[PDB]
Amino acid sequence: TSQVRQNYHQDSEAAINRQINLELYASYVYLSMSYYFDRDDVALKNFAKYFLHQSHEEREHAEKLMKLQNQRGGRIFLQDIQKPDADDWESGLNAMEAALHLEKNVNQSLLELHKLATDKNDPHLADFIETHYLIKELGCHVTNLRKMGAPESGLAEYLFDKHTLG
Amino acid sequence: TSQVRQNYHQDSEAAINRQINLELYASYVYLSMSYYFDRDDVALKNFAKYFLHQSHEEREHAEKLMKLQNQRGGRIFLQDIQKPDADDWESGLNAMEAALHLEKNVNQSLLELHKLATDKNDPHLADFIETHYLIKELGCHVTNLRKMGAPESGLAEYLFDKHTLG
Amino acid sequence: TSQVRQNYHQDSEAAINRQINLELYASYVYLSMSYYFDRDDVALKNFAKYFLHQSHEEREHAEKLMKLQNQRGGRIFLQDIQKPDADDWESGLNAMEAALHLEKNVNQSLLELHKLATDKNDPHLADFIETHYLIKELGCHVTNLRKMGAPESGLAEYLFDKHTLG
Amino acid sequence: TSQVRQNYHQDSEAAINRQINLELYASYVYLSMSYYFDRDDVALKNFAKYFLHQSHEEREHAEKLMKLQNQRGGRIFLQDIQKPDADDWESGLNAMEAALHLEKNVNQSLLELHKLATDKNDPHLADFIETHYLIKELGCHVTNLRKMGAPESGLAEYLFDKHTLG
Amino acid sequence: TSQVRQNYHQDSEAAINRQINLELYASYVYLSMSYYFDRDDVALKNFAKYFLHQSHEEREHAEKLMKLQNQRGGRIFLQDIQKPDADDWESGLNAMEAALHLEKNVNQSLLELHKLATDKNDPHLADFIETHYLIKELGCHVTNLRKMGAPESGLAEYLFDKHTLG
Amino acid sequence: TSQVRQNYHQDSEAAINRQINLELYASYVYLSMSYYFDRDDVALKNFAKYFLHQSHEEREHAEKLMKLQNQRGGRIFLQDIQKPDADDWESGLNAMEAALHLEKNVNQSLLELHKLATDKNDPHLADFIETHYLIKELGCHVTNLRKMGAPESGLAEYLFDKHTLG
């Protein structure tokens, strides 16, 4: 090629295709986590709308990644989206850790992306990718869930529902 | 099975899972066709902001099914989300006619859903596709693009962009 | 054929149109009666403003069906609007008795429509019609008037005009 | 017849009960013309707002007359309202021009009744005619389309649908 | 038959009189359930607001039918209103669970009233069922109390008394 | 048992409960009647919106007794709510006539409840009752109607609706 591209590598153009999927995955996942806490033998809305909100949130990420190609110049190639690993997320504490673990791999994907954003001397790519993500909050809640009665306390969670997910 | 269920001939619960996927696909394909029209060798923002905005709405077509599952008593099984057929489309009219067939499909599996539902005695289920699943539109856009010299008269597309999307 | 026709059967399409020549007949009837009461020599000034609104808000049914046909892919085939029965409407209940009578045939045709709307298994049709038009109220005007002494008492007349229809 | 009747010929009235039958027909035609442009294969919204609007405005045009009758101590004698004429109208251009002829006709009948007003010195009858009626505006559209590429250039009666009817 | 009665079976009516009396019983229980908690030896003001609030809504649900009955031209025939069933209800958990078993009952008598409608095609009757009824909320409640410790844990049905009924 | 019991006797307690089932019988009776006038073949809308109110504010007396009961340490032992005599309520005053005739037996009971409150020298019960429920208003209405010629003058009926019940 287009009249726009310049200093943009074919590798870099493939990676975003890769992330565009991975971030789309996470939306699928959190989506999957969101309605598990909406079903009655769990009944933990808030946990619901928390994950639905992280689901809408990574549902973007991509959507801004797709802007990043239709702007650096590349072409967006979309691949299927995968069903999640589980289907009964056991509990609040389990979920978060899973979310906890899902958000690392997502970020690992980017950490090597900037490592590709430097090896191909793309500063307009050596930006934008470093500041829209990151974990740790999803840590914490783990500690906040660990030290309580989770995932036993069912009581330790219905309280975590109000005073940290309200 | 669970505690809320009653008068929910499982057979339909299976199908509920299938719209979930279906409508998701819709939201995928519309996601596709949305960020092609942001491509710089197309640059048709409004066409984007339209498809970008049909994707979000057929997504919540599905979000507002996974709520119907839990509710009537069911259980939500997700599956992979397959890519669209392209992977990057042809023209506004081509995109338009596209959704047309697509929404005709996603509507086909619902009038195929009223039946089975309009039989297995689920007055509940009978009144949540009856309240808000409808396409007509598009079909009436298709017309507005053909008659104007689309999909070649690029001037037709660009004027359609500012007047029936602005 | 039409590009958005789907599950829309021809028996249906032709019976809609047969219903539009009813819903424009009453409008003409309610119009016919609205201005028998604007006559200087009975001059029930509300019964005039009442049946007027009725002819108005029963030319809106027939319109909403025209919005419907055109939305289901159909084609519209209007016919002559016959003229009501008789030009002198006598009095008050007798026209209220007329308007009752008239509403009931309009109801019975829609019941012949919906009964036809579940033979071809149309969800969209059968949900559109049933969410709108009924009747009763006039039932409680014929009574009142028959209960007060109408129509044969002129003081009964004017009072209901001035205390029910204001 | 009547006590209020005065200076009103037979003759004048009958000449009112046939201009009502006319103004009525015109709305029935404007209806037929407005919903023609509400189809899925025509797709002109502002055309469908226009004639529907003249539809009501002639509805009223016929009503004022009605009251004129009773005010004149007349007796309205309603006849059947005839269908069009046309179902396909069938382009933008070919519609107004059939309304122009439609409007040049109804006005032709105004003038005769008014000459009937001067042949009976019915001045309260004349001043009803020369207040809020007549054509032209259709004309200046008719020219506008032709000058634009109708009916050969759908892009014409499109851009006329938004630039003079929005 | 009655003048407004049309397309209404005996049979449908006498069913309404057996669904009225039922929604009626549905309120009485809630009262019995509200003021149970209004005791000095049970001490949950929020539960007490919550079944007294249901008690007010099922009564409305009962008034809604009366009105349809007559509106259908039916003749309401009231019966005794039977008593609970229970005076000690006799914890938070156990109250909910009998409210769930209760709501499933009255909904059962809806679904068979609805199917009653289909076996005659009574579409005005049918739209009164699928608009403003059903449970779930009681489902999604019972779980929470269970998971928290109820009835083995007054500290739970206390805590649930604020954090989901404040 | 009880810990807030003191100077509350068991003739009292068992007479309070007896009084609630009185005051719920009134509600049921007013409710049987409100939707009597809602019948198409009487339709005195205000008679319906009044007695409907009476059935409220006499379903609210009974509730004000349960709060009292539980306050004074007691227990609530509700019973079957017997049904009103006759489903057809004749006319306007006949319903009014009954309506007084029925207040005179809730008051008569209360007056019998009070004499029990001084013979056991209760102040808090003897003050709560004498500051709430009385009668006569209806007394004036039975007269007005009988003065006008009710019920037998349907015109005396409907006016009283409009000028006194509105």
Numbering used by the authors:
A (entry chain D), B (entry chain C), C (entry chain G), D (entry chain H), E (entry chain X), F (entry chain W): 5 to 170
Copy text from the publication:
To answer this question, we prepared the third NF-8 mutant termed Δ3C-∇C where cysteine residues (Cys90, Cys102, and Cys130) were replaced by alanine (Ala) while Asp144 was mutated to Cys. Three of them exhibited the nearly same electrophoretic behavior as NF-8 (band 1), 16-mer∇C (band 2), and 24-merΔ3C (band 3), respectively, suggesting that they could have similar protein assemblies. Subsequently, we used these four protein assemblies to screen for their suitable crystallization conditions, respectively. Thus, controlling the disulfide bond in protein building blocks can facilitate the conversion of NF-8 into not only the 16-mer and 24-mer protein architectures, but also an even larger 48-mer protein nanocage. It is worth noting that, similar to the mutant Δ3C, one polypeptide of the mutant Δ3C-∇C likewise forms Hα, Hβ, and Hγ subunits, and these three subunits can simultaneously stay in one solution and assemble into 24-mer and 48-mer protein nanocages, these findings being in accordance with the above observation with the mutant Δ3C.
As a standard structural component among protein nanocages, ferritin exists ubiquitously in both prokaryotes and eukaryotes. We have described here a protein-engineering approach to convert the 8-mer protein assembly with C4 symmetry into the 16-mer, 24-mer, and 48-mer protein nanocages with higher symmetry by controlling the intra- or inter-subunit disulfide bond.
